Symmetry: C3
């Protein structure tokens, strides 16, 4: 039963704000959202089996003029895949991606997606979480905002 997970964002709990925050609302059993041998605790994917896993995340940001105004036109759309654990409580970034975007002008719709992927050694007990800026601009669709992991091979 090789470990893996593909979590999709749960808009039914999308926090407001523009500052860097951790996302804790994800789906694990519906649509493309699956999970196995791994446990999820409010946007905190816990590893139960040691191994080399490939981790990835796809976060889509969007804004339509019809939704109203945004604090500032110069945005910083960032995504951070973080690892946390009992021994190491502090957060450490495994991957970082994103871009500054000027969403000014009279344009009606603005969109931008970010993707990151990497190969990492994970020990049971360690947890991966997703931190992003401007969580209010996140796209709610499961094909738009998601993150996952899957074991590729055992640790030597």
């Amino acid at each position: 039963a090789q470990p893996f997970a593909h979590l999709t964002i749960n808009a039914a709990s999308i926090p407001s704000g523009s500052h860097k925050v951790t996302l804790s609302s994800w789906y694990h059993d519906r649509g493309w959202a699956k999970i196995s041998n791994m446990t999820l605790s409010n946007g905190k994917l816990r590893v139960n089996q040691d191994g080399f896993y490939y981790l990835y995340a796809n976060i889509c940001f969007r804004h339509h003029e019809t939704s109203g105004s945004v604090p500032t036109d110069y945005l910083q759309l960032m995504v951070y895949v973080v690892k946390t654990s009992i021994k190491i409580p502090s957060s450490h970034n495994l991957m970082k991606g994103g871009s500054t975007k000027n969403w000014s002008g009279n344009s009606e719709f603005h969109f931008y997606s970010i993707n990151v992927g990497g190969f990492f050694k994970l020990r049971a007990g360690e947890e991966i979480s997703i931190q992003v800026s401007n969580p209010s601009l996140l796209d709610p669709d499961q094909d738009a905002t998601y993150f996952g992991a899957f074991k590729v091979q055992d640790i030597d």
Copy 2:
């Protein structure tokens, strides 16, 4: 010992539109383009073996001012990795990515690439295709625009 695929764009045709369409011309036996156990049917990567596959797509877009007196003020460069089948035949997006761009500047060259990847459960018979907007802006090189998949493990 496991199926896989890496298809590269075949600009043999002349897709000159702006609306989102379904790319149907791909290579499977040239350069890096390859395939094993999987079958290609006019832009349709058909799965001939159940199991979990990692899907990925890289789409490059570019534009030159000389191709002028044509709107490239507001652009929506998007990519969609859709899945179809016999049952569950209605098109369902597995992954979405892209960005809005303003390529009306005095710059002689504009470029932007999109990348998406994810871990998915697939059953034999199901198909995977690629849909993008502004297909006439696609970069033809085999290293710029491509998509693919490879089985990571069997379904439990």
Copy 3:
């Protein structure tokens, strides 16, 4: 003991010029950086065992007005994953990504990341390397700029 590598950028040595270059300084022995059954030489990841490998790279560019000014208003922020050989002086592009960005004044901070991935057939003696434009704008953090590979299955 499947072959793999996750290499992180070594800030120390990084071209301060404005030309596109091959990055030749990466870590393989600290932080998330790691390598197994592959050899890092002169910034090139040499394949020591024939097989199909998944290859990836994540490149982050950034700029703070305190660091001075950009070389030009409309920058080309690109990455090329290249394959060369220890036997013949051949050089081929496997993947390409990036985009043109206007980082002219205004904002106090500019950021942009690119990500590429792909399934490739590699043989012993072949080497994977990274070329980027605007190397002086590279983000030196290990979670920011890195590239890697891992064998998924043997050839044939």
